[PDB]
CSV table of C-alpha atoms and ligand atoms in Angstrom, one decimal:
chain,number,residue,atom,x,y,z
A,9,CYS,CA,203.3,135.3,124.2
A,10,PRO,CA,201.8,131.9,123.4
A,11,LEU,CA,198.2,133.0,122.2
A,12,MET,CA,197.1,136.3,120.7
A,13,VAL,CA,193.5,137.4,119.9
A,14,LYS,CA,192.6,139.5,116.4
A,15,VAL,CA,189.0,141.0,116.0
A,16,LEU,CA,187.8,142.9,112.9
A,17,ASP,CA,184.6,144.5,112.6
A,18,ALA,CA,183.1,143.5,109.0
A,19,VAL,CA,180.5,146.7,108.9
A,20,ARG,CA,183.2,149.8,109.1
A,21,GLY,CA,186.4,147.4,107.5
A,22,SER,CA,188.5,148.2,110.3
A,23,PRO,CA,190.3,146.9,113.4
A,24,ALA,CA,187.7,146.0,116.4
A,25,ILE,CA,188.8,148.2,119.2
A,26,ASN,CA,188.3,147.6,123.1
A,27,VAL,CA,187.0,144.4,122.3
A,28,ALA,CA,186.9,142.3,126.1
A,29,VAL,CA,188.3,139.0,125.4
A,30,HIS,CA,187.9,136.4,128.7
A,31,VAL,CA,190.0,132.9,128.6
A,32,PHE,CA,188.8,129.9,131.0
A,33,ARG,CA,190.6,127.0,131.0
A,34,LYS,CA,188.4,123.5,131.9
A,35,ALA,CA,189.6,122.4,135.4
A,36,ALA,CA,189.9,118.7,136.9
A,37,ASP,CA,186.2,118.9,138.5
A,38,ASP,CA,184.8,119.9,134.5
A,39,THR,CA,184.3,123.7,135.4
A,40,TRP,CA,185.7,126.6,133.5
A,41,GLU,CA,187.9,128.0,135.4
A,42,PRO,CA,189.5,132.0,134.6
A,43,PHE,CA,192.5,131.7,133.0
A,44,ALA,CA,193.3,135.6,131.9
A,45,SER,CA,191.3,138.1,129.9
A,46,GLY,CA,192.2,141.6,128.2
A,47,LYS,CA,190.7,144.1,125.9
A,48,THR,CA,192.2,144.5,122.0
A,49,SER,CA,194.5,147.4,121.0
A,50,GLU,CA,193.6,149.9,118.4
A,51,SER,CA,194.8,147.6,116.0
A,52,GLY,CA,192.4,145.2,116.9
A,53,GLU,CA,194.8,142.9,118.7
A,54,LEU,CA,195.1,141.5,122.0
A,55,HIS,CA,198.7,140.8,123.0
A,56,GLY,CA,200.0,139.6,126.3
A,57,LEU,CA,197.0,137.6,127.7
A,58,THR,CA,199.5,134.9,129.2
A,59,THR,CA,203.1,133.3,129.4
A,60,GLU,CA,204.5,130.0,127.8
A,61,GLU,CA,204.8,129.2,131.6
A,62,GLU,CA,201.3,129.4,132.4
A,63,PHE,CA,199.4,128.1,129.1
A,64,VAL,CA,199.5,124.5,130.2
A,65,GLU,CA,197.9,121.6,128.2
A,66,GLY,CA,194.2,122.0,128.7
A,67,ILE,CA,190.6,122.5,127.2
A,68,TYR,CA,190.5,126.6,126.7
A,69,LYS,CA,187.6,128.6,126.0
A,70,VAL,CA,188.3,132.1,124.4
A,71,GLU,CA,185.3,134.3,125.0
A,72,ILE,CA,185.3,137.4,122.7
A,73,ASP,CA,182.0,139.9,124.0
A,74,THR,CA,180.8,141.0,120.7
A,75,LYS,CA,177.6,141.8,121.7
A,76,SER,CA,179.6,144.5,124.8
A,77,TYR,CA,181.2,145.6,121.6
A,78,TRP,CA,178.4,146.4,119.1
A,79,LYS,CA,176.5,148.0,122.0
A,80,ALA,CA,178.9,150.8,122.4
A,81,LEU,CA,178.4,151.5,118.9
A,82,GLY,CA,175.1,151.8,119.1
A,83,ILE,CA,173.7,148.8,117.5
A,84,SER,CA,171.5,145.7,119.1
A,85,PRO,CA,173.6,142.6,117.8
A,86,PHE,CA,172.1,139.2,117.9
A,87,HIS,CA,174.6,136.9,119.9
A,88,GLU,CA,176.2,137.2,123.4
A,89,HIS,CA,179.7,136.7,122.5
A,90,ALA,CA,181.8,134.4,120.0
A,91,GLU,CA,183.1,131.2,122.1
A,92,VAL,CA,186.0,129.2,120.7
A,93,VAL,CA,186.7,126.4,122.6
A,94,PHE,CA,190.0,124.0,121.9
A,95,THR,CA,192.5,122.0,123.5
A,96,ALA,CA,195.9,123.6,123.0
A,97,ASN,CA,199.1,122.3,123.5
A,98,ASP,CA,198.6,118.3,123.4
A,99,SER,CA,201.5,117.3,121.0
A,100,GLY,CA,203.8,120.0,123.1
A,101,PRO,CA,203.6,124.0,122.8
A,102,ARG,CA,202.2,125.8,120.3
A,103,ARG,CA,201.5,129.6,119.3
A,104,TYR,CA,198.0,130.1,118.8
A,105,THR,CA,196.6,133.3,117.3
A,106,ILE,CA,192.9,133.4,117.4
A,107,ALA,CA,190.8,135.7,114.9
A,108,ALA,CA,187.1,136.6,114.6
A,109,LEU,CA,185.3,138.8,112.0
A,110,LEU,CA,182.4,140.2,113.4
A,111,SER,CA,179.0,141.3,111.9
A,112,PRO,CA,176.3,142.2,113.8
A,113,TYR,CA,174.2,138.9,113.0
A,114,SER,CA,177.7,136.6,112.2
A,115,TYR,CA,180.9,136.0,112.8
A,116,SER,CA,183.5,134.2,112.0
A,117,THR,CA,186.8,132.6,113.9
A,118,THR,CA,189.9,131.1,112.3
A,119,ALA,CA,193.2,129.7,114.5
A,120,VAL,CA,196.2,130.2,113.2
A,121,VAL,CA,198.5,127.6,114.8
A,122,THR,CA,202.6,127.7,114.7
A,123,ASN,CA,205.1,125.8,115.6
B,21,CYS,CA,158.4,125.7,114.5
B,22,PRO,CA,160.7,128.4,115.4
B,23,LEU,CA,164.2,127.4,115.7
B,24,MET,CA,166.2,125.5,112.7
B,25,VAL,CA,170.3,124.7,112.4
B,26,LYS,CA,171.6,124.4,109.2
B,27,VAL,CA,175.1,123.1,109.1
B,28,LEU,CA,177.5,123.2,105.7
B,29,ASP,CA,181.0,121.8,105.2
B,30,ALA,CA,183.2,124.2,103.5
B,31,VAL,CA,186.1,121.3,103.0
B,32,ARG,CA,183.9,118.7,100.7
B,33,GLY,CA,180.9,121.5,99.6
B,34,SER,CA,178.0,119.6,101.1
B,35,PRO,CA,175.6,119.8,103.8
B,36,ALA,CA,177.4,118.3,107.3
B,37,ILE,CA,175.5,115.4,107.7
B,38,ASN,CA,174.7,113.1,111.2
B,39,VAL,CA,176.2,116.7,113.4
B,40,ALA,CA,175.0,116.4,117.0
B,41,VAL,CA,173.4,119.7,118.2
B,42,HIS,CA,172.6,120.6,121.6
B,43,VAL,CA,170.5,123.4,122.6
B,44,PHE,CA,170.7,125.0,126.2
B,45,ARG,CA,168.8,127.7,127.7
B,46,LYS,CA,170.4,129.6,130.7
B,47,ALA,CA,168.8,128.9,133.9
B,48,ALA,CA,168.4,131.5,136.6
B,49,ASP,CA,171.2,130.1,138.2
B,50,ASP,CA,173.6,131.2,135.2
B,51,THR,CA,173.7,127.2,134.5
B,52,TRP,CA,173.2,125.8,131.0
B,53,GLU,CA,170.5,123.3,131.0
B,54,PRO,CA,169.2,120.6,128.3
B,55,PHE,CA,166.4,122.3,126.5
B,56,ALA,CA,166.8,120.4,122.8
B,57,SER,CA,169.1,118.3,120.4
B,58,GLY,CA,169.1,116.3,117.6
B,59,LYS,CA,171.6,115.2,114.5
B,60,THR,CA,170.9,116.8,111.4
B,61,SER,CA,169.3,115.3,108.0
B,62,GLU,CA,171.0,114.3,104.8
B,63,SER,CA,170.3,118.3,103.8
B,64,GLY,CA,172.4,119.1,106.7
B,65,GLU,CA,169.5,120.7,108.4
B,66,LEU,CA,167.8,120.1,112.5
B,67,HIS,CA,164.0,120.6,111.7
B,68,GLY,CA,161.7,120.0,114.5
B,69,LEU,CA,163.6,121.1,117.5
B,70,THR,CA,160.9,123.2,119.5
B,71,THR,CA,158.0,124.6,119.5
B,72,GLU,CA,156.3,128.4,119.9
B,73,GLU,CA,155.1,127.4,123.6
B,74,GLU,CA,158.5,125.9,124.7
B,75,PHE,CA,160.4,128.5,123.0
B,76,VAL,CA,160.3,131.4,125.6
B,77,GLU,CA,162.6,134.8,125.6
B,78,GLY,CA,166.0,134.0,127.3
B,79,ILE,CA,169.6,133.3,126.7
B,80,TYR,CA,170.2,130.1,124.5
B,81,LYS,CA,172.9,128.3,123.3
B,82,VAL,CA,173.7,126.1,120.4
B,83,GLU,CA,176.4,123.6,121.0
B,84,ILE,CA,177.5,122.0,117.4
B,85,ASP,CA,179.7,118.9,117.8
B,86,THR,CA,182.4,119.5,115.1
B,87,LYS,CA,185.1,117.7,116.8
B,88,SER,CA,183.3,114.3,116.7
B,89,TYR,CA,182.0,115.3,112.3
B,90,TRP,CA,185.4,115.6,111.1
B,91,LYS,CA,186.9,112.8,113.1
B,92,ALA,CA,183.9,110.6,111.3
B,93,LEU,CA,185.4,112.0,107.9
B,94,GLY,CA,189.0,111.4,108.9
B,95,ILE,CA,190.1,114.8,109.5
B,96,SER,CA,191.9,116.7,111.8
B,97,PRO,CA,190.1,119.5,113.5
B,98,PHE,CA,190.8,122.4,115.7
B,99,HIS,CA,187.7,122.9,118.0
B,100,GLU,CA,186.1,121.3,120.3
B,101,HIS,CA,182.8,122.0,119.1
B,102,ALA,CA,180.9,125.4,117.8
B,103,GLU,CA,179.3,127.2,120.0
B,104,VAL,CA,176.2,130.2,119.4
B,105,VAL,CA,174.8,131.8,122.2
B,106,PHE,CA,171.9,134.5,121.5
B,107,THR,CA,169.1,136.2,123.1
B,108,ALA,CA,165.9,135.1,121.6
B,109,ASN,CA,163.6,138.2,121.8
B,110,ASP,CA,159.7,138.4,121.0
B,111,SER,CA,159.6,141.3,118.6
B,112,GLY,CA,156.2,140.4,116.8
B,113,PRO,CA,156.5,137.3,114.7
B,114,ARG,CA,159.7,135.2,114.6
B,115,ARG,CA,161.6,132.2,113.1
B,116,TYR,CA,165.3,132.0,113.7
B,117,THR,CA,167.5,129.8,111.4
B,118,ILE,CA,171.1,129.2,112.8
B,119,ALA,CA,174.0,128.1,110.1
B,120,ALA,CA,177.3,127.0,110.6
B,121,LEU,CA,179.8,126.8,107.8
B,122,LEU,CA,182.4,124.4,108.7
B,123,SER,CA,186.2,124.3,108.0
B,124,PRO,CA,188.9,122.3,110.2
B,125,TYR,CA,190.0,125.4,112.0
B,126,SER,CA,187.5,128.0,110.9
B,127,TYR,CA,184.3,128.3,111.2
B,128,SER,CA,181.1,130.9,110.9
B,129,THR,CA,177.6,131.5,112.5
B,130,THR,CA,174.8,133.5,110.9
B,131,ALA,CA,171.6,134.1,112.2
B,132,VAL,CA,168.9,134.7,109.7
B,133,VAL,CA,165.7,135.9,111.5
B,134,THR,CA,162.5,135.9,109.5
B,135,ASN,CA,158.8,136.7,110.1
C,4,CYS,CA,167.9,123.2,87.6
C,5,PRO,CA,171.3,122.6,88.4
C,6,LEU,CA,172.4,126.0,89.5
C,7,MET,CA,171.0,128.1,92.4
C,8,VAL,CA,172.2,131.3,94.0
C,9,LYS,CA,171.4,132.0,98.0
C,10,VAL,CA,172.1,135.1,99.6
C,11,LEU,CA,172.1,136.1,103.0
C,12,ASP,CA,172.9,139.7,105.0
C,13,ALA,CA,174.9,139.3,107.7
C,14,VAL,CA,174.1,143.1,109.0
C,15,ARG,CA,170.4,142.6,109.5
C,16,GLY,CA,170.3,138.7,109.6
C,17,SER,CA,168.2,138.3,106.7
C,18,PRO,CA,167.9,136.8,103.2
C,19,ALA,CA,169.2,139.1,100.9
C,20,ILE,CA,166.6,140.6,98.8
C,21,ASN,CA,165.8,141.8,95.4
C,22,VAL,CA,170.0,141.8,94.5
C,23,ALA,CA,171.0,141.2,91.0
C,24,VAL,CA,172.8,138.0,90.2
C,25,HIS,CA,174.5,137.3,86.8
C,26,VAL,CA,175.9,134.5,85.2
C,27,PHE,CA,179.0,134.3,83.1
C,28,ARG,CA,180.1,130.9,80.8
C,29,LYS,CA,184.0,131.7,79.5
C,30,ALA,CA,183.9,131.5,75.8
C,31,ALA,CA,186.8,130.3,73.8
C,32,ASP,CA,188.4,133.9,73.2
C,33,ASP,CA,188.9,134.2,77.0
C,34,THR,CA,185.5,136.4,77.4
C,35,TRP,CA,182.7,136.3,79.6
C,36,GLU,CA,179.7,135.5,77.5
C,37,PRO,CA,176.1,136.6,79.4
C,38,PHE,CA,174.5,133.3,80.4
C,39,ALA,CA,171.7,133.4,83.1
C,40,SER,CA,170.6,136.3,85.2
C,41,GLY,CA,167.7,137.0,87.6
C,42,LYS,CA,167.1,139.2,90.8
C,43,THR,CA,166.8,136.8,94.2
C,44,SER,CA,163.5,136.4,95.8
C,45,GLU,CA,162.1,137.2,99.5
C,46,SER,CA,163.6,134.2,100.5
C,47,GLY,CA,167.4,135.1,98.8
C,48,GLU,CA,166.7,132.4,96.5
C,49,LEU,CA,167.5,132.9,92.6
C,50,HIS,CA,165.7,129.7,91.1
C,51,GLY,CA,165.2,128.4,87.8
C,52,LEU,CA,168.6,130.0,86.2
C,53,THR,CA,169.4,127.4,83.5
C,54,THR,CA,168.4,123.8,82.7
C,55,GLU,CA,170.6,120.4,83.0
C,56,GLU,CA,170.5,120.9,79.0
C,57,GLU,CA,171.9,124.2,78.6
C,58,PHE,CA,174.5,123.8,81.4
C,59,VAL,CA,177.5,122.5,79.8
C,60,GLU,CA,180.8,121.6,81.3
C,61,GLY,CA,183.3,124.9,81.6
C,62,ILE,CA,184.2,128.0,83.7
C,63,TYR,CA,181.3,130.2,85.1
C,64,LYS,CA,181.5,133.4,86.9
C,65,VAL,CA,178.6,134.2,89.4
C,66,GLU,CA,178.6,138.2,90.0
C,67,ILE,CA,176.4,139.2,92.7
C,68,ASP,CA,175.4,143.0,92.4
C,69,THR,CA,175.8,143.9,96.1
C,70,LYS,CA,177.4,147.2,96.1
C,71,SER,CA,173.2,148.1,94.6
C,72,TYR,CA,172.2,145.9,97.6
C,73,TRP,CA,173.9,148.0,100.1
C,74,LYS,CA,173.1,151.4,98.9
C,75,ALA,CA,169.1,150.5,98.4
C,76,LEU,CA,169.8,149.9,102.3
C,77,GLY,CA,171.6,153.0,103.3
C,78,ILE,CA,174.6,151.4,104.3
C,79,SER,CA,178.0,152.4,102.6
C,80,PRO,CA,179.6,149.3,100.9
C,81,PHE,CA,183.2,148.7,99.8
C,82,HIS,CA,182.7,146.0,97.1
C,83,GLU,CA,181.5,146.5,93.5
C,84,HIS,CA,180.0,142.7,93.3
C,85,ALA,CA,180.7,139.6,94.5
C,86,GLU,CA,182.5,137.4,92.5
C,87,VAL,CA,182.2,133.5,92.1
C,88,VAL,CA,184.6,131.7,89.6
C,89,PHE,CA,184.2,128.0,89.2
C,90,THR,CA,184.6,125.3,86.7
C,91,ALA,CA,181.3,122.7,86.2
C,92,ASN,CA,182.5,119.2,86.0
C,93,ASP,CA,180.4,116.4,84.9
C,94,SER,CA,181.2,113.8,87.9
C,95,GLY,CA,177.8,111.9,87.7
C,96,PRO,CA,174.9,113.7,88.3
C,97,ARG,CA,175.1,117.1,90.3
C,98,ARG,CA,173.5,120.1,91.7
C,99,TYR,CA,175.5,123.2,92.5
C,100,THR,CA,174.0,125.6,94.9
C,101,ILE,CA,176.4,129.2,95.7
C,102,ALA,CA,175.9,130.6,99.0
C,103,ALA,CA,177.0,134.1,99.8
C,104,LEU,CA,176.9,136.0,103.0
C,105,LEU,CA,177.3,139.2,102.6
C,106,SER,CA,178.8,142.1,105.0
C,107,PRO,CA,179.5,145.7,104.0
C,108,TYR,CA,183.5,145.1,104.1
C,109,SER,CA,183.8,141.4,103.4
C,110,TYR,CA,181.7,138.7,101.9
C,111,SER,CA,182.2,134.5,102.2
C,112,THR,CA,180.8,131.9,99.6
C,113,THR,CA,180.5,128.3,99.8
C,114,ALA,CA,179.5,126.1,96.9
C,115,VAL,CA,177.3,123.0,97.9
C,116,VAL,CA,177.7,120.1,95.4
C,117,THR,CA,174.7,117.3,96.1
C,118,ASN,CA,173.9,114.0,93.7
D,26,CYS,CA,202.7,150.2,100.2
D,27,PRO,CA,199.2,151.0,100.4
D,28,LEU,CA,198.0,147.5,99.3
D,29,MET,CA,199.0,144.7,101.5
D,30,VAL,CA,197.1,140.7,100.8
D,31,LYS,CA,197.5,138.1,103.2
D,32,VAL,CA,195.9,134.7,102.5
D,33,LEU,CA,195.1,132.0,105.4
D,34,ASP,CA,194.1,128.4,105.3
D,35,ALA,CA,191.4,126.9,107.1
D,36,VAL,CA,192.4,123.4,106.8
D,37,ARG,CA,195.7,123.5,108.0
D,38,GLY,CA,195.2,126.4,110.5
D,39,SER,CA,198.4,128.6,108.7
D,40,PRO,CA,199.2,130.7,106.5
D,41,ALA,CA,198.9,129.9,103.1
D,42,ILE,CA,202.1,130.3,101.7
D,43,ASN,CA,203.2,131.0,97.9
D,44,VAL,CA,199.7,132.1,96.5
D,45,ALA,CA,200.0,134.1,93.2
D,46,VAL,CA,198.1,137.1,93.4
D,47,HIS,CA,197.3,139.2,90.4
D,48,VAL,CA,195.9,142.9,90.4
D,49,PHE,CA,194.2,144.8,87.8
D,50,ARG,CA,192.9,148.4,87.2
D,51,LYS,CA,189.9,149.4,85.1
D,52,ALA,CA,191.2,151.2,82.5
D,53,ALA,CA,189.5,154.4,80.2
D,54,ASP,CA,188.2,151.8,77.4
D,55,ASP,CA,186.7,149.2,80.6
D,56,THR,CA,189.2,146.5,80.4
D,57,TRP,CA,191.1,145.3,83.3
D,58,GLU,CA,194.8,146.5,82.9
D,59,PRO,CA,197.6,144.4,84.4
D,60,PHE,CA,198.4,146.8,87.5
D,61,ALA,CA,200.7,144.5,90.1
D,62,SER,CA,201.4,141.1,91.3
D,63,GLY,CA,203.3,138.5,93.6
D,64,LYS,CA,203.2,135.7,95.7
D,65,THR,CA,202.1,135.1,99.6
D,66,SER,CA,205.3,134.7,101.7
D,67,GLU,CA,205.7,132.2,104.4
D,68,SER,CA,203.7,134.4,106.3
D,69,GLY,CA,201.0,134.3,104.0
D,70,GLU,CA,201.5,138.0,103.4
D,71,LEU,CA,202.4,140.2,100.3
D,72,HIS,CA,203.8,143.3,100.8
D,73,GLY,CA,205.4,145.5,98.5
D,74,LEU,CA,202.8,145.4,95.1
D,75,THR,CA,202.8,149.0,94.5
D,76,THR,CA,203.7,152.4,95.6
D,77,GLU,CA,201.8,155.5,96.8
D,78,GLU,CA,202.1,156.8,93.7
D,79,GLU,CA,201.6,154.3,91.3
D,80,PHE,CA,198.3,153.7,93.2
D,81,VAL,CA,195.9,156.1,91.7
D,82,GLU,CA,192.0,156.1,91.9
D,83,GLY,CA,190.5,153.4,90.1
D,84,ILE,CA,188.4,150.2,90.2
D,85,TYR,CA,190.8,147.7,91.1
D,86,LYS,CA,190.8,143.9,90.9
D,87,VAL,CA,192.7,141.7,92.9
D,88,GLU,CA,192.6,138.0,91.8
D,89,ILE,CA,193.9,135.2,94.4
D,90,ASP,CA,194.9,132.0,92.5
D,91,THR,CA,193.6,129.8,95.1
D,92,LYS,CA,193.2,126.6,92.5
D,93,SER,CA,196.6,126.5,91.8
D,94,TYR,CA,197.3,126.8,95.9
D,95,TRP,CA,195.2,124.0,96.5
D,96,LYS,CA,196.4,122.1,93.1
D,97,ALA,CA,199.9,122.2,94.5
D,98,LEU,CA,198.9,120.7,98.1
D,99,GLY,CA,197.4,117.8,95.8
D,100,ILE,CA,194.0,119.0,96.3
D,101,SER,CA,190.8,119.4,93.8
D,102,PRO,CA,189.2,123.1,94.8
D,103,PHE,CA,186.0,124.2,93.7
D,104,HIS,CA,186.9,127.8,92.5
D,105,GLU,CA,189.4,128.8,90.2
D,106,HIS,CA,190.4,131.9,92.0
D,107,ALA,CA,189.2,134.7,94.5
D,108,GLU,CA,188.1,138.2,93.0
D,109,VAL,CA,187.9,141.3,95.1
D,110,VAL,CA,187.1,144.1,93.2
D,111,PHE,CA,186.8,147.8,94.7
D,112,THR,CA,187.0,151.6,94.3
D,113,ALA,CA,190.2,152.5,95.7
D,114,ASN,CA,191.2,156.0,96.8
D,115,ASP,CA,187.5,157.8,96.2
D,116,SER,CA,187.9,159.9,99.0
D,117,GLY,CA,191.6,160.4,98.9
D,118,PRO,CA,194.4,157.7,99.3
D,119,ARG,CA,193.9,154.8,102.2
D,120,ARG,CA,196.1,151.6,103.1
D,121,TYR,CA,194.0,148.4,102.2
D,122,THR,CA,194.3,145.4,103.5
D,123,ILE,CA,192.9,142.2,101.5
D,124,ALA,CA,192.6,139.0,103.5
D,125,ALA,CA,191.4,136.1,102.3
D,126,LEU,CA,190.1,132.8,104.3
D,127,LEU,CA,190.5,129.5,102.0
D,128,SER,CA,189.1,126.3,102.4
D,129,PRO,CA,188.1,124.0,98.9
D,130,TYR,CA,184.6,124.8,98.7
D,131,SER,CA,184.5,128.2,100.3
D,132,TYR,CA,186.6,131.5,101.0
D,133,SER,CA,185.8,134.4,102.9
D,134,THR,CA,187.3,137.8,101.8
D,135,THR,CA,187.8,141.2,104.3
D,136,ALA,CA,189.0,144.4,103.4
D,137,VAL,CA,190.5,146.5,106.2
D,138,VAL,CA,191.3,150.1,105.5
D,139,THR,CA,193.0,152.9,107.2
D,140,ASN,CA,193.7,156.3,106.5
E,227,LIG,O1,170.0,127.1,102.1
E,227,LIG,C1,170.8,126.5,101.5
E,227,LIG,O2,171.0,125.7,100.4
E,227,LIG,C2,172.4,127.1,101.9
E,227,LIG,C3,173.6,126.4,100.7
E,227,LIG,C4,174.2,127.3,101.2
E,227,LIG,CL1,175.9,126.9,100.5
E,227,LIG,C5,174.8,128.1,102.4
E,227,LIG,O3,176.1,128.8,102.7
E,227,LIG,C6,175.7,129.5,103.5
E,227,LIG,C7,177.1,130.0,104.2
E,227,LIG,C8,177.0,131.1,105.3
E,227,LIG,C9,176.0,131.5,106.0
E,227,LIG,C10,175.1,130.7,105.6
E,227,LIG,C11,174.4,129.9,104.3
E,227,LIG,C12,173.5,129.7,104.1
E,227,LIG,O4,172.7,129.6,104.7
E,227,LIG,C13,173.6,128.3,103.0
E,227,LIG,C14,172.1,128.0,103.3
E,228,LIG,O1,196.8,140.4,109.7
E,228,LIG,C1,195.8,141.4,109.3
E,228,LIG,O2,196.0,142.9,109.0
E,228,LIG,C2,194.8,141.1,108.8
E,228,LIG,C3,194.1,142.1,108.3
E,228,LIG,C4,192.8,141.0,107.7
E,228,LIG,CL1,191.5,141.9,106.7
E,228,LIG,C5,192.4,139.7,108.3
E,228,LIG,O3,190.9,139.2,107.7
E,228,LIG,C6,190.4,138.2,108.4
E,228,LIG,C7,189.5,137.4,107.9
E,228,LIG,C8,189.4,136.2,108.4
E,228,LIG,C9,190.1,135.4,109.3
E,228,LIG,C10,191.2,136.1,110.1
E,228,LIG,C11,191.5,137.3,109.2
E,228,LIG,C12,192.6,138.0,109.4
E,228,LIG,O4,193.7,137.8,110.4
E,228,LIG,C13,193.1,139.1,109.0
E,228,LIG,C14,194.2,139.8,109.3
E,229,LIG,CA1,199.5,115.3,125.6
E,230,LIG,CA1,162.1,141.8,125.3
E,231,LIG,CA1,185.5,116.7,82.8
E,232,LIG,CA1,187.4,160.7,93.9
């Protein structure tokens, strides 16, 4: 699988478990078409979103549903979601790990890209 | 003005100057409609985006054109842009500062909400 | 003043107020000697730590007492403190802002160096 | 091994390889005694620093030699090192992953603590 998502909780110092993640791909008409979705495991990782065949060149949006995560823990956070938008595979296939570090009023997102 | 945006450059250790910023408000049909925009100043700040009367409760998206910023510096970026999506909530008097700290393959964003 | 420290709270989305900050300069015997200190203001900022004449080239450590900050808010922290160690270098006129963004199990720090 | 260190490069979107890491433990006389050291692998991870028997309660300092890393890549960075100071094992043994995300003028550090 060439796209993995990892989410961490900076309040608890733990993986962020059961975080919903939706991936979209920009269509020819410039709309966001649904591409894949899943939820993080007990390790905070989401594997198996897509395949080498399906994950073609394009502009992708990874929406990490941070508000739903915080609300399930009884917390009212600031952001609706974390949104990571990037062009993928423009110079051939790559493997992408998208990591997000979450706090109620702040997040960071980082990409590790390997060949 | 109840909404300010501040952008910093983690590679050069400087304000991120002349970065385009677009603010959208979510419409009833779930589309994003333009709300305010500008370019960051020499201090990395964008003031005067909106007024108290215009900035009603709702869902807002702040899109920071990070790819064009890095390209103007000759540095290869990952993201198309940085997105910050949040709900404005009238809980007494409030001023929102949206800060973004930019690196080529990572960004962080924080909200500082003060009375 | 050539050195300012700014501290933000990523859990509450606020300046980090009344945080103790200690600055040390590395002495010839590799020990850290006290140089300046204070507490952050209601804006999360600590101004007036030093003067142009006092702030010579050398290695400095900024220690931010994050554990006491979180304890005063009733929140369980990981770190004893946040440390920022850097060399001051006379490359033309320079002002240093050391910013720290605090969460219970994570912090980030950035230097904004301006002319 | 109950202490692992992971380092990422936010400029390249890659593991930070060959980063030196020194761990110290506060001694009874309040000095930092050397505890363990190593270097990150091609994955950006440093395993095998210590053992369950050796990693007793205490206050530990993890120094990540970021300046040497950037200088080996031909870059002049701001910080001397990243310094992570924490009390370990106070409520019994835990496993600690310390992650650092590096840019030339900024870094973040996060702890994931598991039982
Ligand atoms: O007001 C400033 O001068 C200033 C300077 C720095 Cl380095 C800053 O770094 C930051 C790093 C992460 C998140 C927010 C900030 C800031 O809001 C910030 C503000
Ligand atoms: O693989 C891990 O166990 C692990 C642990 C921690 Cl704390 C991590 O913190 C991070 C903080 C910012 C950006 C990325 C990461 C990570 O990718 C990360 C990975
Ligand atoms: Ca292509
Ligand atoms: Ca309301
Ligand atoms: Ca010099
Ligand atoms: Ca104990």
